[PDB]
């Protein structure tokens, strides 16, 4: 089901290990199929429970799936302005 990872291992980020959910931030970047659940998990990574993630999505596939980060950053925030 794999889409309740980021919001419900913010449960698991602080007490166990800060790298553990960062290893699950890696597990986000592993299950790259395809865009839809990929988009929605990382929606919350910007302005919903934390930020400080905008250095981990400038990898070698900067086309649209690793150009989500800019759209994660301020364009869906502009959609929250479009609210």
């Amino acid at each position: 089901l794999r889409c309740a990872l980021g919001v419900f291992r913010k449960f698991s980020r602080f007490p166990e290990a800060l790298r553990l959910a960062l290893m699950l931030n890696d597990m986000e970047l592993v299950e790259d199929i395809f865009t839809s659940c990929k988009d929605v998990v990382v929606q919350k990574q910007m302005a919903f429970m934390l930020g400080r993630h905008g250095v981990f999505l400038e990898l070698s596939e900067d086309v649209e799936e690793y150009e989500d980060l800019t759209e994660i950053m301020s364009n869906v925030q502009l959609n929250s302005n479009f609210l």
Partner: protein, 76 residues
Amino acid sequence: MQIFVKTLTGKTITLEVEPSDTIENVKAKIQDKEGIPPDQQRLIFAGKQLEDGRTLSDYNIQRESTLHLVLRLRGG
């Protein structure tokens, strides 16, 4: 005159230019210091995009004002 070119890498670049100089000459100076060609270079002044066809005076760029440096980022 001196100006400031601030990167997004926390690094500030100083260049000696003249107020009538074009933007592409400044990017050529950036290439002289760094080796990055100007097509891979983007410059932002107070949230405004700079065009190589105009001068520093056209954007009212004066002594030791702060620029922004973002790089061309293409993948695949």
